[PDB]
């Protein structure tokens, strides 16, 4: 719709910086959670797939 007017209320500096930090931290968390699972550890999976790569 007409979401643009939010930039008259929220400071773009604060919003952009906060979104950047949040997305970075979320991505790091998800990747670390995936690496901890020994079913989605892609480094070890590739190790197995190629017989020690």
């Amino acid at each position: 719709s007409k979401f643009y007017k939010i930039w008259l209320i929220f400071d773009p500096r604060r919003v952009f910086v906060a979104q950047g930090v949040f997305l970075f931290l979320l991505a790091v968390m998800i990747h670390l959670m995936l690496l901890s699972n020994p079913g989605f550890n892609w480094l070890d999976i590739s190790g197995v797939k190629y017989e020690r790569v």
């Binding site: 931290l25 790091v28 968390m29 670390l32 959670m33 901890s36």
Partner: peptide
């Protein structure tokens, strides 16, 4: 701090 927390979660 975040990395210590994440280790706790895991």
């Amino acid at each position: 701090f975040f990395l210590v927390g994440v280790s706790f979660i895991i």
